[PDB]
From a paper:
MCPyV cell entry is unique among members of the polyomavirus family as it requires the engagement of two types of glycans, sialylated oligosaccharides and sulfated glycosaminoglycans (GAGs). On the virus side, PyV-receptor interactions are mediated entirely by the major capsid protein VP1, which forms the capsid outer layer.
The structures have 3.5-Å and 3.4-Å resolutions, with no significant differences between them. Overall, six VP1 conformations can be distinguished within the capsid, five from a local capsomer and one from a neighboring strict capsomer, previously annotated with the Greek letters α′, α″, β, β′, γ, and α, respectively. This asymmetric unit of six VP1 chains is sufficient to reconstruct the whole capsid by applying 60-fold icosahedral symmetry. In MCPyV, we observed clear density for five out of potentially six disulfide bridges that connect individual VP1 chains within the strict and local pentamers, respectively, i.e., for the α-α, α′-α″, α″-β, β-β′, and γ-α′ linkages. The MCPyV cryo-EM data further support the presence of this intrapentameric disulfide bond pattern; nonetheless, only the α-α connection is clearly visible in the electrostatic potential map. Neither in the crystallographic electron density nor in the cryo-EM map was this extension visible. Instead, the most-C-terminal residue resolved in either map is Val388γ (from the so-called γ-chain [see below for an explanation of the chain annotation]), meaning that a stretch of 35 amino acids is completely invisible and thus most likely flexible.
Residue numbers in the entry:
A (entry chain A): 20 to 378
B (entry chain C), D (entry chain B): 319 to 371
C (entry chain B): 20 to 53
The structure:
């Protein structure tokens, strides 16, 4: 019948497919909204719950205590670490007449800590009491939060609290620090920040928290939100809800574009000490939830596809070592660019900076 | 044609108008400015903003 | 801007950048000279 | 002008799009492929099907 008699029901964008990981193989229309959600367990030195000699202290640390004899040597599973994921995104139709294509773009990440009501577990067979015949003091102290979504892996300025530390060598997959990302001995410049120590993040539980922060310089394609609240017995606070939406859109309306169709989720939620009754202390992370709401949108490709493939064929594109013409302390002095035409300047050696006239 | 504007030129000489500083090196060899980008005009949206040329 | 009340000079290709190695990244026109 | 056609070039690079297989030798000196014809259009009936062009 006519729409005047049947009652009007407001419109909602309908749900096409619901399920696990293999939903993403579906082909959608030109305009669609994917709402992929995911969690990740917090790697905290103890990477997997299957080693039987060390499985009781999963998502904890060991006795994280000062040594007392210079210098320190912390264990591989004594120091905390980040964690990184990657959901796989499908192919999606490109174009060749306009040199345009489609990429996935996140718009509003939603988050919540899912392990938050386990923090009030005061009864435990090792928690140090507040006083005689008391309850143990519940989990508090050092609080830390950092989550990061983006199309590229997030990058980091490595600065250690002191250069005298000796992190273990990463013969196997181990804790990659600023010592093993350059090869030199850790200079005392690295207590402040340093521009020639800029590692990337591509392993789980192998890039520790205690050696760096995320860099705010190179991560233009990945946003991140962080916090800290430190102190020995300070109270932690956390609010969790189901109606907060963090908008990811930048100043110019762009989003965090999936570069190689990757959606790097990176988190670490180390929060609190639990006091062992012998006096030992241990850091305890909690797993983080996510809800990314990827949306298809158009783009023009950065690079020409023609000249790009010629770099692979070694008969067609050669590469020699030679003498250094790039980077630091190279042997190229002046580069001019001539474009267009105008009237004659006063000399062909114009200096542009204002201050250097007395020198 | 005159290469240098005369009005910006005379501000460079006085220590009041052009203040000099014994500050941390931002111009030189060891300097700490990392990524100076300059924008101009408008164009179509590039694929990733860290365009490796 | 009056041509008859102001002298004229020759036409010379305009300088756009003078500097180190890290200025080859400049997006130029269709007809430049490097 | 690019002398290399890119669509003829890009397929030769991938292992999944173009699979290479370690079979029995089908070109060279010891080729086991014996006789290959090709047909294009249709003319009138030839003298005998054993003729070779």
């Amino acid at each position: 019948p006519k729409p005047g008699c049947c009652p009007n029901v407001a419109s909602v964008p309908k749900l096409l497919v619901k399920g696990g990981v293999e939903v993403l193989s579906v082909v959608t229309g030109e305009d669609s909204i994917t709402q992929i959600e995911l969690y990740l367990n917090p790697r905290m030195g103890v990477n997997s719950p299957d080693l039987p000699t060390t499985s009781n202290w999963y998502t904890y640390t060991y006795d994280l205590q000062p040594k007392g004899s210079s210098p320190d040597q912390p264990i591989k599973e004594n120091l905390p670490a980040y964690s990184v994921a990657r959901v796989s995104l499908p192919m999606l139709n490109e174009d060749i007449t306009c040199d345009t294509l489609q990429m996935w773009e996140a718009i509003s990440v939603k988050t919540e800590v899912v392990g938050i009501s386990s923090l009030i577990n005061v009864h435990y067979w090792d928690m140090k009491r507040v006083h005689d015949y008391g309850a143990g003091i519940p989990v508090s102290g050092v609080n830390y939060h950092m989550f990061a979504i983006g199309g590229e892996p997030l990058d980091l300025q490595g600065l250690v609290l002191d250069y005298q530390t000796q992190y273990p060598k990463t013969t196997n997959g181990g804790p990659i620090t600023i010592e093993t990302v350059l090869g030199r001995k850790m200079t005392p410049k690295n207590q402040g920040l340093d521009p020639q120590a800029k590692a990337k993040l591509d392993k789980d539980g192998n890039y520790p928290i205690e050696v760096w922060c995320p860099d705010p310089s190179k991560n233009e394609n990945s946003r991140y939100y962080g916090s800290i609240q430190t102190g020995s017995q300070t109270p932690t606070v956390l609010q969790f809800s189901n109606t907060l939406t963090t908008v990811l859109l930048d100043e110019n309306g762009v989003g965090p574009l999936c570069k190689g169709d990757g959606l790097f989720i990176s988190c670490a939620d180390i929060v609190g000490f639990l006091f062992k009754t012998s006096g030992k202390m241990a850091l305890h992370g909690l797993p983080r939830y996510f809800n990314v709401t990827l949306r298809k949108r158009w783009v023009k490709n950065p690079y020409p596809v023609v000249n790009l493939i010629n770099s692979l064929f070694s008969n067609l594109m050669p590469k020699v070592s030679g003498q250094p013409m790039e980077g630091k302390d190279n042997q190229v002095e002046e580069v001019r660019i001539y474009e267009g035409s105008e009237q004659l300047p006063g000399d062909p050696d114009i200096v542009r900076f204002l201050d250097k006239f007395g020198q």
